Amino acid sequence: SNAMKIIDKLYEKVSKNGFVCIGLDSSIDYIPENMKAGKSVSEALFSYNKEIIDQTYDVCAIYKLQIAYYESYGIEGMIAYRDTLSYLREKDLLSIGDVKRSDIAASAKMYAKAHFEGDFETDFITLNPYMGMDSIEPYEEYIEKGDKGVFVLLRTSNPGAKDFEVLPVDGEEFFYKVGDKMRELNEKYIGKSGFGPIGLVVGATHSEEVEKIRKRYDKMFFLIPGFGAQKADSMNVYKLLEGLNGGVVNSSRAILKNWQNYEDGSEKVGYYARKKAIETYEEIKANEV
Amino acid sequence: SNAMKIIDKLYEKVSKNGFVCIGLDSSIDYIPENMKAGKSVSEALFSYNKEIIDQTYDVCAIYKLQIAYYESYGIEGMIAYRDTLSYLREKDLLSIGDVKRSDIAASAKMYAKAHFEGDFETDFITLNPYMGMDSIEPYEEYIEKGDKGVFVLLRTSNPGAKDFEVLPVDGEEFFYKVGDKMRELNEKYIGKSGFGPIGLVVGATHSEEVEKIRKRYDKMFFLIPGFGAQKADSMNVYKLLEGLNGGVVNSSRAILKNWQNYEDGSEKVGYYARKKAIETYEEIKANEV
């Protein structure tokens, strides 16, 4: 019965908890003075994440950690990163290491060891495919065993996407060349759920495009990095899902900083993170017709 | 003496010490038993790096650290990374953090803080431009100050480069769109040397192409990630230099493991690293007519 492959576990989690991905992109700047009082940077970051995790574990499918925030704090940040990941793995919870690494061959094998084992072990990592299939192939050793997944950059919604991602190659955007290669790799590893563990990072761009990408890559999970505050934005996110599944939608700052909007927030960081996580799911789902 | 801007400092280092970049892509597997006995992973990696640095600092322009090797050892690896970078700075030597980071906007600003300040501060980093100009622009705050530079992936010589880097856009390779954008940004910051701090990562592919790239991007410094053992390989690298400057050529394992080839290697790690660093410069320079 219970899912074995990590992609099936994620599908399971999305079915049970909804498609929200909570982004623990944590900063000391976000933490109440009373909670950071007396603590080192590593203790403060970990305590804040723990407070959030404990109140949100059943209202999101997965947590994502933008490792840049932890690297910005040096060794103390990396200690918090390790402690958070260990805590997640203890609580039976899923993690994405948002690392977007770029390397090939031996250096990629070292990142695979760094992020799929040991201190920085996560269930999924994000990967940049610029250097070609030998920036993805070295991770297959892990993916083939069934316990680790990747999300590969495809098409993001930032203004810089207009510089390279969308350039015409043979009558279609560049990024489709990347996507189609991952699509054929993914086919080797399809799980019980009908999805494989080679996913794509896809931003909510505009209606026509999100529907085309969703349909073209219907057996890959989408990591949606975030979304804006306007009505078209949540509709476009909704359109990157298939039956409220097949994707997770990241929310970082809105969740991490929600306590700052309430007079009693300093004492209820996790409660207010929870309130936002729930609202996010409800917002996106309300697009259903 | 003299140069203020970091690119002019690199130019001067290449002028004095030659174009070799030493790749401290260190592994516990490369360290003699006598050197790691009684040491934690962080102590062993740093002691090993110091031994190499102490014997090679006048026979290379700069040291490059592939951070994946350090990330593979978790916190201990990050401590050795920190300590190595600090020692290099203490000794008035240059470093490149080979991190090939991908992120944009606030996450890119976090990576800039991570790698241009504090525990993991280096003089140059590598960057992957896939997500567009907003994956480069956030680092400009540092580049503008004169002390930090970057090397942006352009065209690498791995088999995977055939997948995406070379795809036709407007009748020439995709990577030229990238290089042309970096060229224009570089112009803003040209140093006294005639080069600017926005460089490129360029592999030694084949003769016609290395010549074309060297000429098109004549005011940008090249980081050459490595080269093979055949005659054509050293000549193609030589063709990526301008008057024995304008680039550095990385050599990692050959230098790090050279001690392994001699009966007395175990007590002479730095000595044999030095031997190989010198031989590397000679192999390339032998192509000059």
Coordinates of C-alpha atoms in Angstrom, one line a residue:
Chain A
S1 CA 0.0 0.0 0.0
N2 CA 2.2 2.9 1.3
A3 CA 4.2 4.7 -1.4
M4 CA 7.8 3.5 -1.9
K5 CA 9.3 5.8 -4.6
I6 CA 10.0 9.4 -3.4
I7 CA 7.9 10.8 -6.3
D8 CA 5.0 8.7 -5.1
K9 CA 5.5 9.9 -1.6
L10 CA 5.3 13.5 -2.7
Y11 CA 2.2 12.7 -4.8
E12 CA 0.8 11.1 -1.6
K13 CA 1.7 14.2 0.5
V14 CA 0.1 16.6 -2.0
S15 CA -3.1 14.5 -2.0
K16 CA -3.2 14.5 1.8
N17 CA -1.9 18.0 2.7
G18 CA -2.4 20.0 -0.5
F19 CA 0.1 21.4 -3.0
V20 CA 1.7 24.1 -0.8
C21 CA 5.5 24.1 -0.5
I22 CA 6.7 26.1 2.5
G23 CA 10.0 27.9 1.8
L24 CA 12.2 28.1 4.9
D25 CA 14.4 30.8 3.3
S26 CA 15.1 32.0 6.8
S27 CA 16.7 35.2 7.9
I28 CA 17.6 36.5 11.4
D29 CA 15.7 39.6 10.2
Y30 CA 12.4 37.6 10.3
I31 CA 12.7 36.3 13.8
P32 CA 11.1 38.0 16.9
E33 CA 13.7 39.6 19.2
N34 CA 12.4 37.4 22.1
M35 CA 13.0 34.3 20.1
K36 CA 16.6 35.2 19.0
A37 CA 17.5 36.5 22.5
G38 CA 20.5 34.7 23.9
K39 CA 20.9 32.4 20.8
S40 CA 23.7 32.0 18.3
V41 CA 22.8 32.5 14.6
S42 CA 22.6 28.7 14.2
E43 CA 20.3 28.2 17.3
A44 CA 18.1 31.1 16.3
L45 CA 17.6 30.0 12.7
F46 CA 16.9 26.4 13.8
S47 CA 14.4 27.4 16.6
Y48 CA 12.5 29.7 14.2
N49 CA 12.3 26.9 11.6
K50 CA 11.2 24.4 14.2
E51 CA 8.5 26.7 15.4
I52 CA 7.2 27.0 11.8
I53 CA 7.5 23.2 11.0
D54 CA 5.6 22.1 14.1
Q55 CA 2.6 24.2 13.2
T56 CA 2.6 23.6 9.5
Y57 CA 3.6 20.0 8.8
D58 CA 0.1 18.8 8.1
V59 CA -0.8 21.9 5.9
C60 CA 1.9 21.6 3.3
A61 CA 3.3 18.8 1.2
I62 CA 7.0 19.6 1.4
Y63 CA 9.5 22.2 2.6
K64 CA 12.0 24.0 0.4
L65 CA 15.1 25.6 1.7
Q66 CA 16.9 28.2 -0.4
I67 CA 20.4 27.4 0.6
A68 CA 21.7 30.9 -0.3
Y69 CA 20.1 32.2 2.9
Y70 CA 22.0 29.6 5.0
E71 CA 25.3 30.1 3.0
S72 CA 24.9 33.9 3.7
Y73 CA 25.4 33.2 7.4
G74 CA 28.6 31.1 6.9
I75 CA 29.2 28.1 9.1
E76 CA 26.4 29.1 11.6
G77 CA 24.0 29.2 8.7
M78 CA 25.2 25.8 7.4
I79 CA 24.7 24.3 10.9
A80 CA 21.1 25.6 10.9
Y81 CA 20.7 24.1 7.4
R82 CA 21.9 20.6 8.7
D83 CA 19.8 20.8 11.9
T84 CA 16.6 21.8 10.0
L85 CA 17.0 19.0 7.4
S86 CA 17.7 16.4 10.2
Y87 CA 14.5 17.6 12.0
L88 CA 12.4 17.3 8.9
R89 CA 13.7 13.8 8.1
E90 CA 12.9 12.8 11.9
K91 CA 9.3 14.1 11.6
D92 CA 8.7 12.0 8.4
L93 CA 8.6 15.2 6.3
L94 CA 9.8 16.0 2.8
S95 CA 12.5 18.5 1.9
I96 CA 13.8 20.2 -1.3
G97 CA 17.3 21.6 -1.2
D98 CA 17.0 24.6 -3.6
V99 CA 20.6 24.7 -4.7
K100 CA 20.2 25.0 -8.5
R101 CA 23.7 23.5 -9.0
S102 CA 25.3 23.6 -12.5
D103 CA 28.3 21.2 -12.5
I104 CA 29.0 18.0 -14.5
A105 CA 30.8 14.7 -14.1
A106 CA 33.0 14.4 -10.9
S107 CA 31.9 17.8 -9.5
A108 CA 28.3 16.9 -10.0
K109 CA 28.9 13.6 -8.2
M110 CA 30.3 15.6 -5.3
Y111 CA 27.2 17.8 -5.2
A112 CA 25.1 14.6 -5.3
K113 CA 27.0 13.3 -2.3
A114 CA 26.7 16.7 -0.6
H115 CA 23.0 17.0 -1.0
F116 CA 21.6 13.5 -1.1
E117 CA 23.8 12.2 1.9
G118 CA 25.2 13.3 5.1
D119 CA 24.8 16.7 6.8
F120 CA 22.9 18.4 3.9
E121 CA 20.8 15.4 2.9
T122 CA 17.5 16.4 1.2
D123 CA 14.8 14.3 -0.7
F124 CA 14.9 16.5 -3.9
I125 CA 17.3 19.2 -5.3
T126 CA 17.0 21.8 -7.9
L127 CA 19.4 21.7 -10.9
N128 CA 20.5 24.1 -13.6
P129 CA 20.8 22.2 -17.0
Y130 CA 22.9 24.8 -18.9
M131 CA 26.0 22.6 -19.2
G132 CA 24.0 19.7 -20.8
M133 CA 22.8 16.2 -20.0
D134 CA 26.1 15.5 -18.1
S135 CA 24.9 18.0 -15.6
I136 CA 21.9 15.7 -14.9
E137 CA 23.2 12.2 -15.7
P138 CA 25.5 12.0 -12.5
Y139 CA 22.4 12.3 -10.2
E140 CA 20.7 9.3 -11.9
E141 CA 22.7 6.9 -9.6
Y142 CA 20.5 8.3 -6.7
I143 CA 17.3 8.8 -8.7
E144 CA 17.4 5.1 -9.9
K145 CA 17.4 3.8 -6.3
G146 CA 14.0 5.4 -5.9
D147 CA 14.6 7.7 -2.9
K148 CA 15.8 11.0 -4.5
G149 CA 14.3 13.4 -7.0
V150 CA 15.3 16.6 -8.9
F151 CA 13.6 19.6 -10.3
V152 CA 15.3 21.0 -13.4
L153 CA 15.1 24.7 -14.3
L154 CA 12.8 25.1 -17.3
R155 CA 10.8 28.4 -17.7
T156 CA 10.7 31.0 -14.9
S157 CA 8.6 34.1 -14.6
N158 CA 11.4 36.6 -13.8
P159 CA 12.1 39.4 -16.3
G160 CA 15.6 37.8 -17.1
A161 CA 13.8 34.8 -18.6
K162 CA 13.3 37.1 -21.7
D163 CA 17.1 37.2 -22.2
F164 CA 17.9 33.5 -22.8
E165 CA 15.2 31.0 -21.8
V166 CA 12.8 32.1 -24.5
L167 CA 15.2 32.6 -27.5
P168 CA 13.8 31.0 -30.7
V169 CA 15.5 27.6 -31.5
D170 CA 13.9 25.9 -34.6
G171 CA 10.7 27.9 -34.3
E172 CA 10.1 27.3 -30.6
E173 CA 11.5 28.7 -27.3
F174 CA 15.0 27.4 -26.2
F175 CA 13.6 26.1 -22.9
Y176 CA 11.5 23.4 -24.8
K177 CA 14.7 21.8 -25.9
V178 CA 15.7 21.4 -22.2
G179 CA 12.2 20.2 -21.2
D180 CA 11.9 17.6 -23.9
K181 CA 15.3 16.0 -22.9
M182 CA 14.2 15.8 -19.2
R183 CA 10.8 14.4 -20.3
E184 CA 12.5 11.5 -22.1
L185 CA 14.8 10.9 -19.1
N186 CA 11.9 11.0 -16.7
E187 CA 10.1 8.2 -18.7
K188 CA 12.7 5.7 -17.3
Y189 CA 11.5 6.2 -13.7
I190 CA 7.7 6.5 -13.8
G191 CA 6.2 5.7 -10.4
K192 CA 2.8 4.2 -9.3
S193 CA 1.3 7.7 -9.4
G194 CA 2.0 8.2 -13.1
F195 CA 4.7 10.8 -12.4
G196 CA 8.4 10.3 -12.4
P197 CA 11.1 11.9 -10.2
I198 CA 12.6 14.2 -12.8
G199 CA 10.6 17.4 -12.4
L200 CA 10.7 20.9 -13.7
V201 CA 10.9 24.3 -12.1
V202 CA 8.1 26.3 -13.9
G203 CA 6.9 29.8 -13.0
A204 CA 3.4 31.1 -13.6
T205 CA 3.9 33.2 -16.7
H206 CA 0.6 33.7 -18.7
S207 CA -2.4 31.6 -19.5
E208 CA -1.6 30.2 -22.9
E209 CA 1.9 29.3 -21.9
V210 CA 1.1 27.6 -18.6
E211 CA -1.5 25.4 -20.3
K212 CA 0.9 24.4 -23.1
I213 CA 3.8 23.5 -20.6
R214 CA 1.3 21.6 -18.3
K215 CA 0.0 19.5 -21.2
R216 CA 3.4 18.9 -22.9
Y217 CA 5.0 17.6 -19.6
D218 CA 2.1 15.8 -18.0
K219 CA 4.2 13.1 -16.2
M220 CA 6.6 15.5 -14.4
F221 CA 6.0 17.3 -11.1
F222 CA 6.3 21.1 -11.3
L223 CA 8.0 23.2 -8.6
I224 CA 6.4 26.6 -8.9
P225 CA 8.9 29.0 -7.3
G226 CA 6.3 31.6 -6.2
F227 CA 3.5 33.8 -7.4
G228 CA 2.3 37.4 -7.4
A229 CA -0.6 39.0 -5.6
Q230 CA -2.9 39.7 -8.6
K231 CA -5.9 37.6 -9.7
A232 CA -4.3 36.3 -12.9
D233 CA -1.4 35.1 -10.8
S234 CA -3.3 32.5 -8.7
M235 CA -5.3 31.4 -11.8
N236 CA -2.0 30.7 -13.7
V237 CA -0.7 28.7 -10.7
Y238 CA -3.9 26.7 -10.6
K239 CA -3.4 25.9 -14.4
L240 CA 0.0 24.3 -13.6
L241 CA -1.7 21.7 -11.5
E242 CA -3.5 18.5 -12.7
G243 CA -6.4 17.6 -10.3
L244 CA -4.8 19.7 -7.5
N245 CA -1.6 17.6 -7.8
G246 CA 1.4 17.2 -10.1
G247 CA 3.0 20.4 -8.7
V248 CA 3.9 22.2 -5.5
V249 CA 3.6 25.9 -5.1
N250 CA 6.4 27.6 -3.1
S251 CA 5.6 30.4 -0.6
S252 CA 8.4 31.8 1.5
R253 CA 8.3 35.4 2.8
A254 CA 4.4 35.6 3.1
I255 CA 4.5 32.6 5.4
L256 CA 7.7 33.4 7.3
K257 CA 6.8 37.0 8.0
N258 CA 3.0 36.7 8.5
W259 CA 3.5 37.1 12.3
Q260 CA 4.6 40.7 11.8
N261 CA 1.1 41.7 10.7
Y262 CA -0.5 40.9 14.1
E263 CA -0.2 42.4 17.5
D264 CA 0.3 39.0 19.2
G265 CA 2.5 37.7 16.4
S266 CA 5.8 37.5 18.3
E267 CA 4.3 34.7 20.4
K268 CA 2.6 32.9 17.5
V269 CA 5.1 32.7 14.6
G270 CA 4.1 29.1 13.8
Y271 CA 0.4 29.8 14.2
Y272 CA 0.5 32.7 11.7
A273 CA 2.7 30.8 9.3
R274 CA 0.0 28.1 9.4
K275 CA -2.7 30.6 8.8
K276 CA -1.0 31.8 5.7
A277 CA -0.1 28.3 4.4
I278 CA -3.9 27.4 4.6
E279 CA -4.9 30.7 3.0
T280 CA -2.4 30.0 0.1
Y281 CA -3.9 26.6 -0.6
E282 CA -7.5 28.0 -0.4
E283 CA -6.6 31.0 -2.7
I284 CA -5.3 28.8 -5.5
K285 CA -8.0 26.1 -5.2
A286 CA -10.8 28.7 -5.4
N287 CA -9.8 29.0 -9.1
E288 CA -11.6 25.7 -9.6
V289 CA -14.6 25.9 -11.9
Chain B
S1 CA 52.9 48.0 -6.3
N2 CA 50.1 48.8 -7.2
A3 CA 47.0 47.6 -9.0
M4 CA 43.7 48.7 -7.2
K5 CA 41.0 46.8 -9.1
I6 CA 40.8 43.0 -8.7
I7 CA 41.0 42.3 -12.4
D8 CA 44.2 44.3 -12.6
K9 CA 45.5 42.4 -9.6
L10 CA 44.8 39.2 -11.5
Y11 CA 46.4 40.5 -14.7
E12 CA 49.5 41.4 -12.6
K13 CA 49.5 38.0 -10.9
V14 CA 49.4 36.3 -14.4
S15 CA 52.2 38.5 -15.5
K16 CA 54.4 37.7 -12.5
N17 CA 53.5 34.0 -11.9
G18 CA 52.2 32.8 -15.2
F19 CA 48.6 31.7 -16.1
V20 CA 48.2 28.5 -14.0
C21 CA 45.2 28.3 -11.7
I22 CA 45.7 25.7 -9.0
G23 CA 42.4 23.8 -8.3
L24 CA 42.2 23.0 -4.6
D25 CA 39.3 20.5 -5.2
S26 CA 40.5 18.6 -2.2
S27 CA 39.4 15.1 -1.1
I28 CA 40.4 13.1 2.0
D29 CA 41.3 10.4 -0.6
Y30 CA 44.2 12.5 -1.9
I31 CA 45.9 13.1 1.5
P32 CA 48.8 10.9 2.8
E33 CA 47.8 8.8 5.8
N34 CA 50.6 10.6 7.9
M35 CA 49.0 14.0 7.2
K36 CA 45.4 13.0 8.1
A37 CA 46.1 10.8 11.1
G38 CA 44.8 12.3 14.2
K39 CA 43.0 15.1 12.4
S40 CA 39.3 15.8 11.9
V41 CA 38.1 16.2 8.2
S42 CA 38.3 20.0 8.5
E43 CA 41.8 19.9 10.0
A44 CA 43.1 17.4 7.4
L45 CA 41.7 19.3 4.4
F46 CA 43.1 22.6 5.6
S47 CA 46.5 21.1 6.5
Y48 CA 46.8 19.5 3.0
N49 CA 45.7 22.8 1.3
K50 CA 48.2 24.8 3.3
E51 CA 51.0 22.4 2.4
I52 CA 50.2 22.9 -1.3
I53 CA 49.7 26.6 -1.0
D54 CA 53.0 27.1 0.8
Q55 CA 55.0 25.5 -2.0
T56 CA 53.0 26.9 -5.0
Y57 CA 52.1 30.5 -4.3
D58 CA 54.8 31.9 -6.6
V59 CA 54.1 29.4 -9.5
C60 CA 50.4 30.1 -10.1
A61 CA 48.3 33.3 -10.5
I62 CA 45.3 32.2 -8.4
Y63 CA 43.6 29.2 -6.6
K64 CA 40.2 27.9 -7.5
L65 CA 38.1 25.9 -5.1
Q66 CA 35.3 23.7 -6.5
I67 CA 33.0 24.1 -3.5
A68 CA 31.2 20.8 -4.3
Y69 CA 34.2 18.9 -2.8
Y70 CA 33.8 20.9 0.5
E71 CA 30.0 20.6 0.5
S72 CA 30.4 16.8 0.1
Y73 CA 32.0 16.7 3.6
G74 CA 29.2 18.7 5.2
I75 CA 30.0 21.2 8.0
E76 CA 33.6 19.9 8.4
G77 CA 34.1 20.5 4.7
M78 CA 32.7 24.0 5.0
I79 CA 35.1 24.8 7.9
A80 CA 38.1 23.8 5.7
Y81 CA 36.7 25.9 2.9
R82 CA 36.4 28.9 5.3
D83 CA 39.9 28.3 6.7
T84 CA 41.5 27.9 3.2
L85 CA 40.0 31.1 1.9
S86 CA 41.1 33.0 5.0
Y87 CA 44.7 31.7 4.7
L88 CA 44.9 32.6 1.0
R89 CA 43.7 36.2 1.9
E90 CA 46.1 36.3 4.9
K91 CA 48.9 35.5 2.4
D92 CA 48.0 38.1 -0.2
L93 CA 46.9 35.4 -2.7
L94 CA 43.9 35.4 -5.0
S95 CA 41.0 32.9 -4.9
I96 CA 38.0 31.8 -7.1
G97 CA 35.0 30.2 -5.4
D98 CA 33.9 27.8 -8.1
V99 CA 30.2 27.8 -7.1
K100 CA 28.4 28.3 -10.5
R101 CA 25.4 29.8 -8.7
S102 CA 22.1 30.2 -10.7
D103 CA 19.7 32.3 -8.6
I104 CA 18.2 35.8 -9.2
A105 CA 17.2 38.9 -7.3
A106 CA 17.1 38.4 -3.5
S107 CA 18.5 34.9 -3.5
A108 CA 21.3 36.1 -5.8
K109 CA 22.0 38.9 -3.2
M110 CA 22.2 36.2 -0.5
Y111 CA 24.7 34.3 -2.6
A112 CA 26.7 37.5 -3.1
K113 CA 26.7 38.1 0.6
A114 CA 27.7 34.4 1.2
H115 CA 30.6 34.4 -1.3
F116 CA 31.9 38.0 -1.3
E117 CA 31.8 38.5 2.5
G118 CA 32.3 36.7 5.7
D119 CA 33.2 33.0 6.2
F120 CA 33.2 32.1 2.5
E121 CA 34.6 35.4 1.0
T122 CA 36.5 34.9 -2.2
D123 CA 37.8 37.3 -4.9
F124 CA 35.9 35.9 -7.9
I125 CA 33.0 33.5 -8.3
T126 CA 31.6 31.5 -11.2
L127 CA 28.0 32.1 -12.2
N128 CA 25.5 30.3 -14.4
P129 CA 23.5 32.8 -16.6
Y130 CA 20.5 30.6 -17.6
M131 CA 17.9 32.6 -15.7
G132 CA 19.0 35.8 -17.5
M133 CA 20.6 39.2 -16.7
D134 CA 18.9 39.3 -13.2
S135 CA 21.1 36.3 -12.3
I136 CA 24.2 38.6 -12.9
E137 CA 23.0 42.1 -12.1
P138 CA 22.7 41.5 -8.3
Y139 CA 26.4 40.9 -8.1
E140 CA 27.2 44.3 -9.7
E141 CA 26.9 46.1 -6.3
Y142 CA 30.2 44.2 -5.5
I143 CA 31.8 44.3 -8.9
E144 CA 31.3 48.1 -9.0
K145 CA 33.3 48.6 -5.8
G146 CA 36.4 47.2 -7.6
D147 CA 37.2 44.3 -5.3
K148 CA 35.2 41.3 -6.7
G149 CA 34.9 39.7 -10.1
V150 CA 32.9 36.9 -11.7
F151 CA 33.4 34.3 -14.4
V152 CA 30.1 33.5 -16.3
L153 CA 29.6 30.2 -18.1
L154 CA 29.9 30.6 -21.8
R155 CA 31.1 27.5 -23.8
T156 CA 32.6 24.4 -22.1
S157 CA 34.3 21.5 -23.7
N158 CA 32.2 18.7 -22.1
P159 CA 30.0 16.4 -24.3
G160 CA 26.9 18.0 -22.7
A161 CA 27.8 21.3 -24.3
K162 CA 26.3 19.8 -27.6
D163 CA 22.9 19.6 -25.9
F164 CA 22.1 23.2 -25.3
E165 CA 25.1 25.7 -25.4
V166 CA 25.5 25.2 -29.1
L167 CA 21.9 25.3 -30.3
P168 CA 21.3 27.8 -33.2
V169 CA 19.8 31.1 -32.4
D170 CA 19.8 33.7 -35.2
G171 CA 22.3 31.5 -37.1
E172 CA 25.0 31.0 -34.5
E173 CA 25.4 29.2 -31.2
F174 CA 23.2 30.1 -28.3
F175 CA 26.2 30.8 -26.1
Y176 CA 27.1 33.9 -28.2
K177 CA 23.9 35.5 -26.9
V178 CA 25.2 35.0 -23.4
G179 CA 28.7 36.2 -24.2
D180 CA 27.5 39.3 -26.0
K181 CA 25.4 40.3 -23.1
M182 CA 28.3 39.8 -20.7
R183 CA 30.7 41.8 -23.0
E184 CA 28.4 44.8 -22.9
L185 CA 28.2 44.7 -19.0
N186 CA 32.0 44.2 -18.8
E187 CA 32.6 47.5 -20.7
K188 CA 31.2 49.4 -17.7
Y189 CA 34.2 48.3 -15.5
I190 CA 37.4 48.1 -17.7
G191 CA 40.5 48.2 -15.6
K192 CA 44.0 49.7 -16.3
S193 CA 45.0 46.4 -17.8
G194 CA 42.5 46.6 -20.6
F195 CA 40.4 43.8 -19.1
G196 CA 37.2 44.1 -17.0
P197 CA 36.0 42.0 -14.0
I198 CA 33.2 40.2 -15.9
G199 CA 34.9 37.2 -17.3
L200 CA 33.8 34.0 -19.0
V201 CA 34.3 30.3 -18.5
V202 CA 35.7 28.9 -21.7
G203 CA 36.8 25.3 -22.4
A204 CA 39.4 24.4 -25.1
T205 CA 37.2 23.0 -27.8
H206 CA 38.8 23.1 -31.3
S207 CA 41.2 25.6 -33.0
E208 CA 38.8 27.7 -35.1
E209 CA 36.3 28.1 -32.3
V210 CA 38.9 29.0 -29.5
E211 CA 40.3 31.7 -31.9
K212 CA 36.9 33.1 -32.7
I213 CA 35.9 33.3 -29.0
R214 CA 39.2 34.8 -28.0
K215 CA 38.9 37.6 -30.6
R216 CA 35.2 38.3 -30.0
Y217 CA 35.7 38.7 -26.2
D218 CA 39.1 40.4 -26.2
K219 CA 38.6 42.5 -23.0
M220 CA 37.3 39.6 -20.8
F221 CA 39.5 37.3 -18.7
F222 CA 38.9 33.6 -19.4
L223 CA 38.7 30.8 -16.8
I224 CA 39.7 27.6 -18.6
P225 CA 38.3 24.7 -16.5
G226 CA 41.0 22.2 -17.5
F227 CA 42.5 20.4 -20.5
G228 CA 43.3 16.9 -21.7
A229 CA 46.6 15.2 -22.3
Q230 CA 46.9 15.3 -26.1
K231 CA 48.9 17.7 -28.2
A232 CA 45.9 19.5 -29.6
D233 CA 44.6 20.1 -26.1
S234 CA 47.6 22.3 -24.9
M235 CA 47.5 24.2 -28.2
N236 CA 43.8 25.0 -28.0
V237 CA 44.4 26.3 -24.4
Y238 CA 47.3 28.4 -25.6
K239 CA 45.0 29.9 -28.3
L240 CA 42.7 31.2 -25.5
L241 CA 45.5 33.4 -24.1
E242 CA 46.5 36.9 -25.3
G243 CA 50.3 37.5 -24.8
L244 CA 50.3 34.7 -22.1
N245 CA 47.6 36.6 -20.2
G246 CA 43.9 37.3 -20.4
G247 CA 43.1 33.9 -18.9
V248 CA 44.0 31.3 -16.3
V249 CA 44.1 27.6 -16.9
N250 CA 42.9 25.4 -14.0
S251 CA 44.6 22.1 -13.1
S252 CA 43.2 20.2 -10.1
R253 CA 43.9 16.5 -9.7
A254 CA 47.2 16.3 -11.5
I255 CA 48.6 18.8 -9.0
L256 CA 46.8 17.5 -5.9
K257 CA 47.8 13.8 -6.6
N258 CA 51.2 14.2 -8.1
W259 CA 52.9 13.1 -4.8
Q260 CA 51.3 9.7 -5.4
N261 CA 53.7 9.0 -8.3
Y262 CA 56.9 9.2 -6.3
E263 CA 58.4 6.8 -3.7
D264 CA 59.0 9.8 -1.4
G265 CA 55.7 11.5 -2.2
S266 CA 54.1 11.2 1.2
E267 CA 56.4 13.8 2.9
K268 CA 56.6 16.0 -0.2
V269 CA 53.0 16.8 -1.2
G270 CA 53.7 20.5 -1.8
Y271 CA 57.0 19.8 -3.5
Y272 CA 55.3 17.5 -6.1
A273 CA 52.3 19.9 -6.5
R274 CA 54.9 22.6 -7.3
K275 CA 56.6 20.4 -9.8
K276 CA 53.4 19.8 -11.6
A277 CA 52.2 23.4 -11.5
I278 CA 55.5 24.4 -13.2
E279 CA 55.1 21.6 -15.8
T280 CA 51.6 22.8 -16.5
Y281 CA 52.8 26.3 -17.5
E282 CA 55.6 24.7 -19.6
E283 CA 53.2 22.4 -21.5
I284 CA 51.0 25.3 -22.6
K285 CA 53.8 27.8 -23.2
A286 CA 55.6 25.2 -25.4
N287 CA 53.0 26.1 -28.1
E288 CA 54.2 29.7 -28.5
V289 CA 56.1 30.2 -31.8

